[model samples]
Structures are given as C-alpha cells and as structure tokens.
Target: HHHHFNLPPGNYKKPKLLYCSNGGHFLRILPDGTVDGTRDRSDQHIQLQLSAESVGEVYIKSTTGQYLAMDTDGLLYGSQTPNEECLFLERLEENHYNTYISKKHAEKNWFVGLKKNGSCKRGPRTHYGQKAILFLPLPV
Candidate 1:
C-alpha cells in the first residue's frame, strides 16, 4: 500500500519531541538561564532547537533563542551566543537512547543530566547516578 504523489520535500513535515530520559519530564529553559524538567510536555518553551553544527556536534537552543550552555565550573545555563560552551557532542547510546555531552568538557565526560529536584546539572557520563542524561523524542 504505497502512495506517492511526487510532493516537494518542503511539504513533508519534520517531527520533534521534548522527552526526558528517566524522570519522564520535558526539558525546558527558563528566562533566567535555568534548565529543568516539566511534566507538561506541551509547553512551547520546552521545544528545543536540536540543530547540528558538525558531524557529532550540536546546538540546543530554546524557542526564546537562548542556547544551553555549560560554564567553566560545569554549571548549566542559557546563553545568548552559541560559543564553544554551547556546543555539545550528541552521542547515541547502546540502549537506543541519546546522550548530550558538553563539547567544552568532553575530555572530562560532562553530560547533561537532570537532578532529583528537576534541576539541570553536568555530571560524568559513567557515573550517571540517579539522573537522566539521555533524552529521546516521544512519538509525534
């Protein structure tokens, strides 16, 4: 049952999601440079611009144009500029989940993780503890 009409590529839609890994919350960016998880997945602020910069590097920007950034101390913040701190290495894990490691601290394995209180923090990739560092998309 294949139906084809030779539609333009632009006519096709691109599906996206705001799924969190472990806690079952949608990742969101606050106006005050805070990143957290929200149970309300429909919030437009949680919609991220997961765009690619290089082969494995990507930029995660909020709808408000704030980029997810990692500071010198492994703190998570929303930055306006897509500098080196804003870049991330998108890794596809073996469990079919995806992990986002900060390019600025790749040597240290600083991955984007959600704390118990729904706060965004940077932690080691191996010692994920009780956080969800991998975020995949929900069905559209």
Candidate 2:
C-alpha cells in the first residue's frame, strides 16, 4: 500500500538524532579542551559532531554496536558538544535525568562481539562500553 501527498519538500520531517556511541575512554580533547569521560552516559543520547581537530579511535564492539574506551573523564566542565538533534525526553519519574542507564548485569553476562582483528580493539579487554539510548519512543 502507498500513500502520496502534494505537500512541499519542507513539509517532510527530519530525524532528530539523539547520541553517538561515545564508547571507549580515549585521550580525546573536546572543543573546550576538557577530557571526555568516554564511558560515562551523562552525555549520551546527547552529542553529535566530535571536534574534527580531536582525533581518536571510535571503535565498536558486538553486533549490538557498543562502543569502548581506553580512559574516560566525562562530559562535564563545560567542554562537550551536544548531539546535533534536540531531544526533549519525558522521564517516567520526576527525578530521572531525562534518560539514563545502569550497566550492572550487562557487565557480567552475555556480552559478545568485537572487531575480528585484535588490533581494532582499544582500551582494556575487561571493559566494554555497554549503554543504551533513551529513544524518544520506547521499543515494545
């Protein structure tokens, strides 16, 4: 089935991207010269373009597309960029910080996948950047 509308191109909706997998804690300098606590989700579902001048490896693990880090400093100290899209999250509770996660059980079991080449892996083997997005629409 198909439907068509004669609306103008500007009428189309654009996807508001929430976050990039700021996986492993690498030695990355933010635009403001602050270090990135790469593993922290404090700024997840919230950052877009990384500084072009800031060069670092953005590696992923697992078919789940989890990111990893070597060292982490977090996105505080006014030194980070928000993801390009605007995310107006509605928390289930009044106290929740729009979106967040707890990486407890995930750390202990069923974690899988890394780039086939050992060289592609960055950071420590004991840790993986396991986090989930607070998607605007929750998945059923």
Candidate 3:
C-alpha cells in the first residue's frame, strides 16, 4: 500500500500553506486566531507550523502559537491551547495533495473545507475526495 510512504513526525518543514481547490484559495490563520481562506498566494497569515503529536496526526499551530481547533458545531478556529480537538489525521491523497480530517470527529467524516468565495466551510459540510476538502501543502 501507499501507506509506507506516509512520513513520520518532523518531516514537514517549518511553515506551510494549505491550498484548497474549491476556492482556488489557500488556508489562512489570522493573528487573532480566526480561520478563513485567501486567494492571495503571498498572504502572511497562510503561514502555519505543522507538527505531529504521535504518528500520522498533526497539530497545526498558527504563527501566533494558536492551535487549529474544530468544534462540534463544525466550526474551525485557532485556540490558544492544543487539545484533542486540535489533532487532525493527515493523509496524502492519490492526487498528491493532503487532506486533514479531525481526529476527534474522524468517524463523522469531518474534513477541512473552503468555499468558492474563499470562505471557510463548516466541517459537517465537507467530505472526502471533494475539491473543497482537498488541500495542497506548500512551502510558505
């Protein structure tokens, strides 16, 4: 299986930007911990530190030290603390892009998604193989 190519912790560089095909926008985490998407490729808020907790999961922290957290209400936000909700199961799809699903809500098919207008879509509205939920991790 392709799982053997799954990277271990520390393989990812310091910063990365998650690009969503849905909106042709990249993920952005603001200094104030807000979650959104931007079409600006040079956007500074797209900078995020990706780190794994144990194995295949990662905790995305904003430059301001806020961890990417998802709520039960399908909301995505940056929290000051890293909790269970901050963990995400990272996977590389056949398309060579990365997809992140909540570790806490993995069973519920909650994946990160963006709208055509570069807006953040609720996790409940996302699913696998969708362009909105497909992400390409690129260097910042």
Candidate 4:
C-alpha cells in the first residue's frame, strides 16, 4: 500500500532581501511584528530568510527570527511565534520574479502588497494596478 504524507522537504533558497517591485524598496521587518518597505539597502532589518518546503510552499523569516504572516483581515505582518499562517505560495511570474500569496488568504486571493508609503499590506489578486505582487529576492 502506498501511503502519502506531507513530510518531504524540498530545496530551500538562501537568505535574501525581498525587494518590492513597486519602487525598489525592500521589505523591512520591525521588532514589533509590523512589516514595511525601505529604500536603504544597508538596513539589516530588510534582510529576510526565504525557504522552500515543497514545490510551491515557502516560508519567509525576518532577521529578528519572526515569520512573515498574514492575518484574518489579509493584513501583512510578522510573527515571532511561527504558525501555519506564515506559509506562502510562491508563484513565479513572467518577469522572472516571484509573487507571494498568503496561504491563509486562499479563499480571497490576497497577495503581499507594498503600499505607496512603504507600509506592507495584502491586496486582492484581481487589482493588478502597480502589482505589488512582484517580489525579487536579492542576495544577502
């Protein structure tokens, strides 16, 4: 009998700086569990750990050891205590970058959104305006 279980881990990528496609800003993780973007490449707060669990499953961690998470309202944030909500689906785009969609927001199709003011948020997948969707990972 062939039994299947979700246990095998896949290839994981090295730590990287998650760059916002909107304005070349990088995702910054605050110690208070808030997430934002910054233009300063020297800021260590913007460094992130991107890991792959399976083909499409990924995990994003901050320098502070917190995980990038989405809440019930589709708000983007960070969590010191890791949880399943932190898991994201990595979807590759035509531009050769990747888009992170919250696995928690699968019902609503919410993707990580980098607001104009550099605040991190989750936007509906249908709204392809500025496409905060594209997040390019920069080498650490």
Highest lDDT: which candidate?
Answer: 3
lDDT of each: 0.68, 0.23, 0.82, 0.73
Q: Candidate 1: where are CA atoms >4 Å away?
A: 1-15, 124-131
* Whole-model alpha-carbon lDDT for candidate 2: 0.23
Question: TM-score of model 3 relative to the true fold?
Answer: 0.89
Among all windows of ten consecutive residues in candidate 2, which has the lowest summed lDDT? 3-12
Question: Poorest 10 consecutive residues of model 1 by lDDT?
Answer: 3-12
Residue 4 error, candidate 1, Å? 39
Candidate 2 lDDT over residue span 4-27, tens digit each:
112111111221222223233222
Put down candidate 4 lDDT per residue, 38-90, tens digits, no spaces: 99999979888878776677888988899988887777788887787898877
Candidate 3 local lDDT, 4-77, one digit each (tens): 23442336656888888877898888978789999888777788889877778899988788898899888999
RMSD values for the candidates in order, in angstroms, are 8.7, 16.2, 3.1, 5.5
Error of 4 at 131 (Å): 2.2
- Candidate 1 lDDT tens digits, 50-135: 77777667788887889988888887889987899999777665445566777878778788877645677655433333347767
**Backbone clashes under 3 angstroms, per model:** 0, 11, 0, 0
Candidate 1, TM-score vs. the true structure?
Answer: 0.79
In candidate 3, clashing pairs total 0
Q: Candidate 3, 122: how far from true, in Å?
A: 0.7
